């Protein structure tokens, strides 16, 4: 099926969804050095944004090859940030906790 | 750009080679702080370098 090559470290974005319930995968639960994967059943909406309005510059670095950088910021300076819903995230964490409690 | 809680950017000017390869001109650009490192261990708050 369609495989999404999304680059992420802590979370999984735009992945597949489980059929019935959250499913926990691990090579061996006894070994703490391994990495434990949790595949969710319901997605969690996440909205990231960069409010800054950057300007694209062009500098002739070498012959016939241009270099692009940030020239100036128009308006005020703000913080780029990501938003998720607290209630849905807490419910998802509780679901993951009850799923983990089977092994513990 | 002035003090604030934002990560902010640094306005750095440097000499770039123009279309003539034996001539230089002055240019400037805004760079992120993680991409900027002090050039040398000596105390100098005006001279910097890329992280590369």
């Amino acid at each position, epitope marked *: 099926h369609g495989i999404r090559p999304v680059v992420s470290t802590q979370l999984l974005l735009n992945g597949s969804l489980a059929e019935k319930e959250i499913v926990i995968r691990s090579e061996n639960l006894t070994n703490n050095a391994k990495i434990i994967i949790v595949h969710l059943h319901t997605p969690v909406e996440i909205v990231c944004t960069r*409010p800054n*309005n950057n300007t694209r510059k062009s500098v002739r670095i070498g012959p016939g090859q241009t270099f692009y950088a940030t020239g100036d910021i*128009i*308006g*005020d*300076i*703000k*913080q780029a*940030h990501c938003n998720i819903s607290e209630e849905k995230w807490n419910d998802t964490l509780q679901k993951v906790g009850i799923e983990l409690q089977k092994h513990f | *750009v*002035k*003090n*604030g*809680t*934002v990560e902010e950017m640094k306005n750095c000017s440097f000499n770039t080679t123009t279309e003539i390869r034996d001539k230089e001109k002055k240019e400037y650009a805004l760079f992120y702080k993680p991409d900027i490192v002090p050039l040398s261990e000596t105390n100098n708050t005006s001279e910097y370098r890329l992280i590369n």
Partner: antibody
Framework: QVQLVQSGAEVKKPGASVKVSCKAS????????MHWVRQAPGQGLEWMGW????????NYAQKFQGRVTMTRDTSISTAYMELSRLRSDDTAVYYC????????????????????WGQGTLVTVS | QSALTQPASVSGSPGQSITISCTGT?????????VSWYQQHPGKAPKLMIY???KRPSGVSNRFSGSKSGNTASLTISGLQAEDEADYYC??????????FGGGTKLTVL
């Protein structure tokens, strides 16, 4: 409540510089932007610029960059407007207004929402 | 440099519905929903009447309204009185953190 107070009257010869003080009371000075506009007699409202009290970030409209400057004093909570190179047509009332809310997540500087206005400073170059 | 295009004179009568429309370029009113209407009597400071095209601030009655279509915005006033004879200004956000005001209008009551 929210109160903005400026100078009453101002007389200045052409070619000099003028300082206008906008003192705000009744609310946190660093919570909202501060806008400066100008109104000539007969003519409507001309928008000059805005200033963020927290940082030193200021923005001015066209035909005013370099000619005017905006600063602030947080200890006394007073905005300063320094205008140089006064001409014969600069005889006008300068008004100080309160902009949007500073949130640090979206740009609220450009919203034209001015709840409160000062009495205005009348600069005369007659 | 040109400001927003606004009528210079609007006349009406008491107990009538009158609309004053201000229009601008494709960058000021074409894709931004920040249009405000202020009123100003001579000799005193202005005050807000309508903000965000159709919303109403606290302290203003239900006499005023608003609209937003294409590249123009209209202030509709129903039930005019003799107190409404003053200046009306239509302000908008022109992009790049710039605020632009209208040309100016003077409401007349016959």
């Amino acid at each position: 409540q929210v109160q903005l107070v400026q100078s009453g009257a101002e007389v200045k010869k052409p070619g000099a510089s003028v300082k206008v003080s906008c003192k705000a009371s009744g609310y946190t000075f660093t919570g909202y932007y501060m806008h400066w506009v100008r109104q000539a007699p007969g003519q409507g409202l001309e928008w000059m610029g805005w200033i963020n009290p927290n940082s030193g970030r200021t923005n001015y409209a066209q035909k005013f960059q370099g000619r005017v400057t905006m600063t602030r004093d947080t200890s006394i909570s007073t905005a300063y407007m320094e205008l140089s190179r006064l001409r014969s047509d600069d005889t006008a009332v300068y008004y100080c207004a309160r902009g949007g809310w500073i949130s640090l997540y979206y740009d609220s500087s450009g919203y034209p929402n001015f709840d409160y206005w000062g009495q205005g400073t009348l600069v005369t170059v007659s | 440099q040109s400001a927003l295009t606004q009528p210079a004179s609007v006349s009406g009568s008491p107990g009538q519905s009158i609309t004053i429309s201000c229009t601008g370029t494709s960058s000021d009113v074409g894709s931004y929903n920040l249009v405000s209407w202020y009123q100003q009597h001579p000799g005193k400071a202005p005050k807000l009447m309508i903000y965000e095209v159709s919303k109403r601030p606290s302290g203003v009655s239900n006499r005023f309204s608003g609209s937003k279509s294409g590249n123009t915005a209209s202030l509709t006033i129903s039930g005019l009185q003799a107190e409404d004879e003053a200046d009306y200004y239509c302000c908008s956000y022109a992009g790049s953190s710039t605020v632009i005001f209208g040309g100016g209008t003077k409401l007349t009551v016959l």
